[PDB]
Design a protein around this motif. Structure first.
Motif, PDB file in Angstrom:
ATOM      1  N   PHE B 246       0.818  -1.184  -0.036  1.00  9.84           N
ATOM      2  CA  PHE B 246      -0.236   0.005   0.009  1.00  9.84           C
ATOM      3  C   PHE B 246       1.028   1.111  -0.033  1.00  9.84           C
ATOM      4  O   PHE B 246       0.495   2.272  -0.650  1.00  9.84           O
ATOM      5  CB  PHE B 246      -0.926  -0.002   1.182  1.00  9.84           C
ATOM      6  CG  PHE B 246      -2.077   0.747   0.878  1.00  9.84           C
ATOM      7  CD1 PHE B 246      -3.397   0.249   0.742  1.00  9.84           C
ATOM      8  CD2 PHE B 246      -2.111   2.288   0.983  1.00  9.84           C
ATOM      9  CE1 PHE B 246      -4.586   1.100   0.666  1.00  9.84           C
ATOM     10  CE2 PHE B 246      -3.356   2.928   0.790  1.00  9.84           C
ATOM     11  CZ  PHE B 246      -4.443   2.369   0.742  1.00  9.84           C
ATOM     12  N   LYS B 247       2.114   1.260   0.858  1.00  7.30           N
ATOM     13  CA  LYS B 247       2.759   2.341   0.734  1.00  7.30           C
ATOM     14  C   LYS B 247       3.366   2.817  -0.548  1.00  7.30           C
ATOM     15  O   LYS B 247       3.594   3.769  -0.803  1.00  7.30           O
ATOM     16  CB  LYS B 247       3.903   2.369   1.858  1.00  7.30           C
ATOM     17  CG  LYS B 247       5.017   1.153   1.730  1.00  7.30           C
ATOM     18  CD  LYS B 247       4.834   0.266   2.889  1.00  7.30           C
ATOM     19  CE  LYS B 247       4.614   0.682   4.225  1.00  7.30           C
ATOM     20  NZ  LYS B 247       3.821  -0.155   5.055  1.00  7.30           N
ATOM     21  N   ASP B 248       3.254   1.608  -1.454  1.00  5.28           N
ATOM     22  CA  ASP B 248       4.194   2.017  -2.684  1.00  5.28           C
ATOM     23  C   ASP B 248       3.282   2.777  -3.737  1.00  5.28           C
ATOM     24  O   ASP B 248       3.402   3.054  -4.546  1.00  5.28           O
ATOM     25  CB  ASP B 248       4.227   0.628  -3.315  1.00  5.28           C
ATOM     26  CG  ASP B 248       5.388  -0.281  -2.713  1.00  5.28           C
ATOM     27  OD1 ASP B 248       6.321   0.342  -2.055  1.00  5.28           O
ATOM     28  OD2 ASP B 248       5.121  -1.525  -2.671  1.00  5.28           O
ATOM     29  N   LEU B 249       1.874   2.581  -3.171  1.00  9.58           N
ATOM     30  CA  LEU B 249       1.140   3.849  -4.031  1.00  9.58           C
ATOM     31  C   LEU B 249       1.332   5.261  -3.977  1.00  9.58           C
ATOM     32  O   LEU B 249       0.819   6.053  -4.612  1.00  9.58           O
ATOM     33  CB  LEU B 249      -0.382   3.839  -3.512  1.00  9.58           C
ATOM     34  CG  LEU B 249      -1.012   2.321  -3.639  1.00  9.58           C
ATOM     35  CD1 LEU B 249      -2.548   2.172  -2.956  1.00  9.58           C
ATOM     36  CD2 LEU B 249      -0.930   1.725  -5.188  1.00  9.58           C
ATOM     37  N   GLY B 250       2.233   5.560  -2.984  1.00  5.56           N
ATOM     38  CA  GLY B 250       2.815   6.849  -2.723  1.00  5.56           C
ATOM     39  C   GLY B 250       1.610   7.904  -2.381  1.00  5.56           C
ATOM     40  O   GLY B 250       1.928   9.068  -2.415  1.00  5.56           O
ATOM     41  N   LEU B 251       0.526   7.369  -1.700  1.00  4.31           N
ATOM     42  CA  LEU B 251      -0.453   8.413  -1.181  1.00  4.31           C
ATOM     43  C   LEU B 251      -0.076   9.143   0.037  1.00  4.31           C
ATOM     44  O   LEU B 251       0.741   8.408   1.058  1.00  4.31           O
ATOM     45  CB  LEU B 251      -1.772   7.738  -0.913  1.00  4.31           C
ATOM     46  CG  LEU B 251      -2.167   6.955  -2.219  1.00  4.31           C
ATOM     47  CD1 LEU B 251      -3.455   6.118  -2.006  1.00  4.31           C
ATOM     48  CD2 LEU B 251      -2.117   7.653  -3.485  1.00  4.31           C
ATOM     49  N   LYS B 252      -0.562  10.319   0.360  1.00  4.18           N
ATOM     50  CA  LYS B 252      -0.545  10.850   1.801  1.00  4.18           C
ATOM     51  C   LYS B 252      -1.638  11.789   1.755  1.00  4.18           C
ATOM     52  O   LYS B 252      -2.489  12.255   0.599  1.00  4.18           O
ATOM     53  CB  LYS B 252       0.872  11.566   1.834  1.00  4.18           C
ATOM     54  CG  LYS B 252       1.101  12.822   0.857  1.00  4.18           C
ATOM     55  CD  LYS B 252       2.499  13.394   1.261  1.00  4.18           C
ATOM     56  CE  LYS B 252       2.778  14.503   0.351  1.00  4.18           C
ATOM     57  NZ  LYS B 252       4.067  15.216   0.832  1.00  4.18           N
ATOM     58  N   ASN B 293      -2.566   5.619 -11.916  1.00  9.10           N
ATOM     59  CA  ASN B 293      -1.734   5.721 -13.007  1.00  9.10           C
ATOM     60  C   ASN B 293      -2.599   6.519 -14.286  1.00  9.10           C
ATOM     61  O   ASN B 293      -3.273   7.195 -13.682  1.00  9.10           O
ATOM     62  CB  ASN B 293      -1.714   4.202 -13.735  1.00  9.10           C
ATOM     63  CG  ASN B 293      -2.769   3.359 -13.814  1.00  9.10           C
ATOM     64  OD1 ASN B 293      -3.745   3.632 -14.689  1.00  9.10           O
ATOM     65  ND2 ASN B 293      -3.283   2.572 -12.690  1.00  9.10           N
ATOM     66  N   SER B 294      -2.438   6.191 -15.393  1.00  7.09           N
ATOM     67  CA  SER B 294      -3.160   6.739 -16.539  1.00  7.09           C
ATOM     68  C   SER B 294      -4.690   6.538 -16.669  1.00  7.09           C
ATOM     69  O   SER B 294      -5.224   7.211 -17.575  1.00  7.09           O
ATOM     70  CB  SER B 294      -2.539   6.920 -17.753  1.00  7.09           C
ATOM     71  OG  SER B 294      -2.517   5.305 -18.248  1.00  7.09           O
ATOM     72  N   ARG B 295      -5.027   5.701 -15.868  1.00  9.30           N
ATOM     73  CA  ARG B 295      -6.683   5.222 -16.332  1.00  9.30           C
ATOM     74  C   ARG B 295      -7.206   4.612 -14.971  1.00  9.30           C
ATOM     75  O   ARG B 295      -8.400   4.533 -14.672  1.00  9.30           O
ATOM     76  CB  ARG B 295      -6.617   3.972 -17.169  1.00  9.30           C
ATOM     77  CG  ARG B 295      -8.027   3.427 -17.761  1.00  9.30           C
ATOM     78  CD  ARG B 295      -7.786   2.766 -18.826  1.00  9.30           C
ATOM     79  NE  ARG B 295      -9.097   1.576 -18.729  1.00  9.30           N
ATOM     80  CZ  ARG B 295      -8.886   0.370 -18.549  1.00  9.30           C
ATOM     81  NH1 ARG B 295      -7.732  -0.282 -18.220  1.00  9.30           N
ATOM     82  NH2 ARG B 295     -10.118  -0.445 -18.478  1.00  9.30           N
ATOM     83  N   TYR B 296      -6.578   4.375 -13.810  1.00 11.79           N
ATOM     84  CA  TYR B 296      -7.211   3.776 -12.632  1.00 11.79           C
ATOM     85  C   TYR B 296      -7.217   4.404 -11.434  1.00 11.79           C
ATOM     86  O   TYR B 296      -6.176   5.366 -11.080  1.00 11.79           O
ATOM     87  CB  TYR B 296      -6.418   2.590 -12.384  1.00 11.79           C
ATOM     88  CG  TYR B 296      -6.627   1.264 -13.235  1.00 11.79           C
ATOM     89  CD1 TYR B 296      -7.906   1.302 -14.125  1.00 11.79           C
ATOM     90  CD2 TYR B 296      -5.803   0.238 -13.619  1.00 11.79           C
ATOM     91  CE1 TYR B 296      -8.195   0.193 -14.914  1.00 11.79           C
ATOM     92  CE2 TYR B 296      -6.210  -0.745 -14.481  1.00 11.79           C
ATOM     93  CZ  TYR B 296      -7.382  -0.702 -14.958  1.00 11.79           C
ATOM     94  OH  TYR B 296      -7.526  -1.766 -15.786  1.00 11.79           O
ATOM     95  N   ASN B 297      -8.299   4.685 -10.881  1.00  7.89           N
ATOM     96  CA  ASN B 297      -8.534   4.989  -9.485  1.00  7.89           C
ATOM     97  C   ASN B 297      -7.651   4.454  -8.384  1.00  7.89           C
ATOM     98  O   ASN B 297      -7.043   3.621  -8.718  1.00  7.89           O
ATOM     99  CB  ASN B 297     -10.139   5.007  -8.946  1.00  7.89           C
ATOM    100  CG  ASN B 297     -10.789   6.128  -9.350  1.00  7.89           C
ATOM    101  OD1 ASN B 297     -10.180   7.380  -8.695  1.00  7.89           O
ATOM    102  ND2 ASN B 297     -12.062   6.272  -9.565  1.00  7.89           N
ATOM    103  N   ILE B 298      -7.367   5.176  -7.328  1.00 11.37           N
ATOM    104  CA  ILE B 298      -6.928   4.404  -6.099  1.00 11.37           C
ATOM    105  C   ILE B 298      -7.896   3.118  -5.663  1.00 11.37           C
ATOM    106  O   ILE B 298      -7.409   2.251  -5.394  1.00 11.37           O
ATOM    107  CB  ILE B 298      -6.834   5.423  -4.842  1.00 11.37           C
ATOM    108  CG1 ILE B 298      -5.743   6.555  -5.183  1.00 11.37           C
ATOM    109  CG2 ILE B 298      -6.106   4.527  -3.578  1.00 11.37           C
ATOM    110  CD1 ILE B 298      -4.323   6.094  -5.707  1.00 11.37           C
ATOM    111  N   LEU B 299      -9.016   3.408  -5.933  1.00  7.13           N
ATOM    112  CA  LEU B 299     -10.105   2.231  -5.671  1.00  7.13           C
ATOM    113  C   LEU B 299      -9.909   1.234  -6.516  1.00  7.13           C
ATOM    114  O   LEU B 299      -9.856   0.016  -6.029  1.00  7.13           O
ATOM    115  CB  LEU B 299     -11.416   2.667  -5.616  1.00  7.13           C
ATOM    116  CG  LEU B 299     -12.347   1.832  -5.094  1.00  7.13           C
ATOM    117  CD1 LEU B 299     -12.356   1.566  -3.650  1.00  7.13           C
ATOM    118  CD2 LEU B 299     -13.926   2.607  -5.419  1.00  7.13           C
TER     119      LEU B 299
END
Ligand code: HEM
Ligand code: HEM
Ligand SMILES: CCCOc1ccc(-c2ccc3c(C)cc(N)nc3c2)cc1CN
Ligand SMILES: CCCOc1ccc(-c2ccc3c(C)cc(N)nc3c2)cc1CN
Ligand SMILES: CCCOc1ccc(-c2ccc3c(C)cc(N)nc3c2)cc1CN
Ligand SMILES: CCCOc1ccc(-c2ccc3c(C)cc(N)nc3c2)cc1CN
Ligand SMILES: [Zn+2]
Lengths: 412, 409
Positions: B246-252, B293-299
């Protein structure tokens, strides 16, 4: 203010409601209070009935594009003479069918209304006894069930006369499971049905005392005392609940019945009151209330699922309740689909309702909708109805709540 | 008439008398309910509004009819006569601001209403001074992660041509950029305001989590840009307690929710700039709508990394990924000791709050449509709680975005 606008905040689509001008009865709200989350916020006299019947007959003749015709005027005069001489009137078969379909179409709390025009209407107004009620109800259950390819249907028993000869189905649904309060305070079976279960036993039902005992029908014809009947078990289609991934889920021993058939509401058409009118469709997965059952002496299904999932149940912020709830709903949908029993998930149902709602605004000028009841009980904001503004108002024909018959019945 | 509200799980029945004191409209009528609709002065009109407020202030300190109550009414009346407006006393401002929160029918966090730090910024005259007041608000409210509720109140509206406004919708938000194809870098909710800041001279870093500058309007003048000092912006990297990927998603996300585009009305006076802040309920954090990415939500991306079947909706992959995202949000704030509340605890507190308010105040205005959380509604205790919604003042109100009304210079 002839027009009212509603906005969808995800799509920005704006719809214009004019249908609300035909609203008949009060909401309970005022300009200074909203009662939108309140659960619910002597027969009609002659003079009360004339305008209600005329409004309905007018609406019917408009729908068949014969408004103002010779047949319309003759029907109006016929109804007026019946009310003048008998204080009530009888609907034609066509009007009964139209009225039942439109009570569904007008049901602001129903997310499934895209199907409203396909309702199969069974006319049971010639019924005179509780045995005949049982026959009609068995045929309804068999037809609607259709070996798992469920079909929506309503069976309409004779209308109210003086209020002392009512037809009633004392059951809240045609198929429901018994619940038994144990001496130690716990509950065996469905806790929602303990009061009605006690009534049945009191009337003479011999309870199997299991977890999933289908309740008997308690049927009242012509105001007489109600009579018990056992639905033939081969007519009751049931689904064992299992999970596509969790081998242990089947070991919970859960099942549910396929046919939701609500039987305690009143159908109002043109001022006439049909107090026995059971109607059935198919389930949305989230409705199935297997979650409240007890697996053992202390734990909910929700708690027991979470425990078998090895979730941390000491803090709420672990969201173990949310996790377990999703998995239970996965199992319900998987099981019905595996058994080829009609069911709809909440994403599909709400997407269809929005398409339905838009079509009704375009073709009918509006669609009364109760957001508090349309939004599903889980994952609200990821379904399309959450960001959809709605207008709620009451059109007739309509389905209405009525008192429980044991509170009002005068025992013979 | 007194009105009953019932909880259908506990069968507790509360009796509402407070709705009899409401004077503002809700939007509904006897024939149409508009409970899901989002949005349904002169010298001559000001004193009745002021008298009503001064009356309830002196009733709240149990000095109704007192000498000070009468003198204050006489003072406010003379001041409206001579100046077409009036100034609240410090005590009245604090009372008013706290009761606007107390009266916010859509807020589930109101058990905390009387613990609100009120910052009087009514002496402010420039956007530079607004920036200073707002920096002090952010620093005090953040409190190194032990978040504290606060409001800062800038000068009230005069003729409507001299409004103070925070053009931002929140004090801290991330920019959002329209990509050449059509996807979105950063927060899709803020694309429009970001473009306004760029038009106004802001140089965008064009990343995923660019804190937006403050755009501040004082005394009806053209708004001015300011960079919040980055050490004042507390942020939380989002990670998951089970999923190491999950941390690899880079979210904060940022720790401090501070809404700055609403209007505070007290005793007929309108405070068009009044940013207020508390702490988040985890379901609020809008990290769901970001693009990985270019097409996908976090969900959608979370569902992918979870290896769910995304071809049918009845697999409930959306519902599963949503729960996991919200688990990660709560775990991350708790791990960094940044105040957050989950929706189970928050709705439980609100039911207790309703009990308190019916007991001591005779009711609590509540908007079920907004109080029930946006997931798992029926397994929270508010779902089965009947509520009565009605509009009391002091109150927070919606107001138009300034870029639709402002005439530049
Ligand atoms: C065909 C599939 C159908 C689906 C999927 C469906 C779905 C639903 C759902 C999910 C609710 C709310 C349930 C709850 O909150 O527990 C509801 C309520 C309701 N449905 Fe439908 N329904 C269907 C068919 C029908 C039919 C055939 C009728 C009548 C002819 C009907 C009349 C109603 C009414 C009156 C309510 C509101 C009950 C109340 O106010 O208490 N539905 N429906
Ligand atoms: C202290 C912690 C607080 C929490 C957890 C909290 C929680 C919430 C939530 C979850 C919502 C609805 C969210 C949504 O629909 O997206 C809301 C609405 C609202 N909150 Fe609170 N809140 C808090 C503090 C405050 C404070 C300090 C104020 C003002 C002094 C306030 C004023 C409001 C208002 C006015 C609304 C409704 C806005 C509208 O009508 O659009 N809240 N709150
Ligand atoms: C106890 C408060 C909740 O009341 C409720 C809640 C729900 C329904 C209801 C009615 C008909 C349904 C049909 C035909 C299909 C279906 N899938 N679902 C239904 C749900 C009735 C009542 C009142 N009898
Ligand atoms: C006499 C029947 C007792 O059962 C009951 C009684 C009440 C409710 C209930 C209450 C409030 C609701 C709201 C505000 C929204 C919504 N969408 N649904 C609700 C359902 C359900 C049940 C079924 N457990
Ligand atoms: C964008 C449509 C929804 O409007 C909304 C939705 C939510 C809030 C709101 C306001 C204050 C909050 C505080 C102090 C703490 C907190 N945790 N949450 C809040 C949420 C405001 C508005 C008005 N912009
Ligand atoms: C200009 C702001 C655009 O954003 C918006 C705009 C609108 C809503 C919105 C709309 C309807 C809601 C209903 C019926 C209930 C509820 N509980 N909440 C809602 C929130 C959220 C957002 C946030 N994306
Ligand atoms: Zn209303």
């Amino acid at each position: 203010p002839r027009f009212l606008k509603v906005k969808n905040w995800e799509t920005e689509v704006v719809l214009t409601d004019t249908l609300h001008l035909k609203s008949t009865l009060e909401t309970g709200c005022t300009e200074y209070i909203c009662m939108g989350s309140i659960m619910h916020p002597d027969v009609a006299t002659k003079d009360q009935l004339f305008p209600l019947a005329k409004e309905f007959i007018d609406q019917y003749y408009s729908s068949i594009k014969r408004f103002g015709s010779k047949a319309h005027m003759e029907r109006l005069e016929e109804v007026n003479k019946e009310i003048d001489t008998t204080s009530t009137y009888q609907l034609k078969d066509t009007e009964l069918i139209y009225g039942a379909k439109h009570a569904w179409r007008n049901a602001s709390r129903c997310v499934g209304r895209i199907q409203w025009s396909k309702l199969q209407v069974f006319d049971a107004r010639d019924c005179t006894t509780a045995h005949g009620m049982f026959n009609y109800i068995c045929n309804h259950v068999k037809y609607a069930t259709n070996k798992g390819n469920l079909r929506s249907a309503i069976t309409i028993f004779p209308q109210r006369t003086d209020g002392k000869h009512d037809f009633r189905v004392w059951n809240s649904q045609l198929i429901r499971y018994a619940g038994y309060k144990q001496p130690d305070g716990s509950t065996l079976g469905d806790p929602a049905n303990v009061q009605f279960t006690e009534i049945c036993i009191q009337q003479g039902w011999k309870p199997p005392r299991g977890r999933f005992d289908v309740l008997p029908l308690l049927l009242q014809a012509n105001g007489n005392d109600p009579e018990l009947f056992q639905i033939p078990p081969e007519l009751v289609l049931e689904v064992p609940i299992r999970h596509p991934k969790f081998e242990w889920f089947k070991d919970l021993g859960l099942k549910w019945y396929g046919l939701p058939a609500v039987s305690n509401m009143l159908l109002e058409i043109g001022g006439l009151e049909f107090s026995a009118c059971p109607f059935s469709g198919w389930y949305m997965g989230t409705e199935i209330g297997v979650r409240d059952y007890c697996d053992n002496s202390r734990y909910n299904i929700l708690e027991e699922v979470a425990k078998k999932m090895n979730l941390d149940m000491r803090k709420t912020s672990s969201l173990w309740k949310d996790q377990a709830l999703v998995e239970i709903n996965i199992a319900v949908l998987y099981s019905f689909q595996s058994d080829k029993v009609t069911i709809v998930d909440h994403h599909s149902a709400t997407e269809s309702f929005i398409k339905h709602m838009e079509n009704e605004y375009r073709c009918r000028g509006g669609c009364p909708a109760d957001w508090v009841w349309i939004v599903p009980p889980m994952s609200g904001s990821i379904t399309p109805v959450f960001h959809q503004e709605m207008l709620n108002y009451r059109l007739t024909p309509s389905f209405e709540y009525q008192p429980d018959p044991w509170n009002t019945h005068v025992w013979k």
